[PDB]
């Protein structure tokens, strides 16, 4: 079976170098070129180029030239994407492909998310959020959990060990000083709080911090 | 296999160099009406060396 796996999420800093690996299976490696496609932070897919594999020849898209590279290893069927002088604007997801030439490809790579930032590994600030009188609308009391300033991704935010997923919305996090801030809100009826325990469980194995915070009434 | 490629014996390159002229000659074409002729004419009378 043809399945393209890549190096996983990579943590980088501006000014360094990286070689992004693409490991291929199900076919002879030198027989298919590797189409490299960058996904811009705005979710634009920007095509990096294709490497003639035989012959080991990279073909760059002009915008990607001279700070990027395509290198290969034939025996283990691993294609490599080399990047020099890392830049924060390069934070993105990268992809490889098994070449069907001018019709492109039938199989997409697993993807590689490069993160170029200059933070310190940090545990999140996990705050139980007490709803006020105006926060109780329509028989339900909405509760929330602020996850503030954690690096790196991901964080597992559950509620009462994940026992109640009903009204749980775990929102994405964006960059603040290269730190991530997200919030998660559980929606339970007003009869369940503060009658029943509601505790947001934030598991951040990257910083090795599992935080448990219960919301208390005011 | 040592330089830049995985094959042998051949290659292709495009060599470009910006042209800069240090010095250039210029030609001229002569129009017939524009040609003038200054013709000194003199008759011998009483004359000196001056």
């Amino acid at each position: 079976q043809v399945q393209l796996m890549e190096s996983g999420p990579e943590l980088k800093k501006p000014g360094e170098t990286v070689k992004i690996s693409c490991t291929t299976s199900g076919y002879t490696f030198t027989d298919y070129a590797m189409h490299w496609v960058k996904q811009a932070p705005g979710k634009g897919l920007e095509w990096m180029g294709w490497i003639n594999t035989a012959t080991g020849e990279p073909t760059y898209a002009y915008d990607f030239k001279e700070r990027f590279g395509f290198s290969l290893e034939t025996s283990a069927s691993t294609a490599f994407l080399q990047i020099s002088n890392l830049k924060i604007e390069d934070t993105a997801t990268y992809f490889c492909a098994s070449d069907g030439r001018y019709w492109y490809f039938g199989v997409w790579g697993a993807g590689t998310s490069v993160t170029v930032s200059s933070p310190k590994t940090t545990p999140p600030s996990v705050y139980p959020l007490a709803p006020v009188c105006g926060d109780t609308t329509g028989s339900m009391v909405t509760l929330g959990c602020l996850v503030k300033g954690y690096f790196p991704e991901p964080v597992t935010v559950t509620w009462n060990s994940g026992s109640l997923s009903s009204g749980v919305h775990t929102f994405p996090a964006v960059l603040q000083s290269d730190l991530y801030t997200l919030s998660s809100s559980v929606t339970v009826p007003s009869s369940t709080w503060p009658s029943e325990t509601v505790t947001c469980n934030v598991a951040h194995p990257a910083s090795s911090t599992k935080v448990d915070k219960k919301i208390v009434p005011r | 296999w040592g330089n830049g490629c995985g094959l042998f014996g051949k290659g292709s390159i495009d060599t470009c160099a910006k042209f800069s002229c240090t010095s250039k000659a210029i030609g001229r074409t002569i129009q017939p009406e524009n040609i003038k002729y200054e013709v000194g004419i003199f008759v011998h009378g009483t004359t000196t060396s001056e």
Side-chain angles (χ1 to χ4, degrees), chain A residues 35-51:
Chain A
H35 296 288
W36 291 97
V37 177
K38 181 180 179 181
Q39 183 173 355
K43 191 179 170 59
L45 291 174
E46 191 179 4
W47 180 84
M48 293 184 284
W50 60 273
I51 176 169

Side-chain angles (χ1 to χ4, degrees), chain A residues 9 13 16 22 54 65 73 113 131 140-141 144 187 210 212-213:
Chain A
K13 292 190 294 185
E16 295 177 350
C22 172
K65 183 179 292 296
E73 185 279 337
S113 63
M140 66 192 85
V141 290
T187 299
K210 292 166 62 181
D212 294 343
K213 297 298 183 181

Side-chain angles (χ1 to χ4, degrees), chain A residues 82-93:
Chain A
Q82 186 174 355
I83 295 171
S84 64
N85 192 30
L86 291 170
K87 292 165 61 181
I88 296 171
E89 296 83 357
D90 288 344
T91 298
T93 59

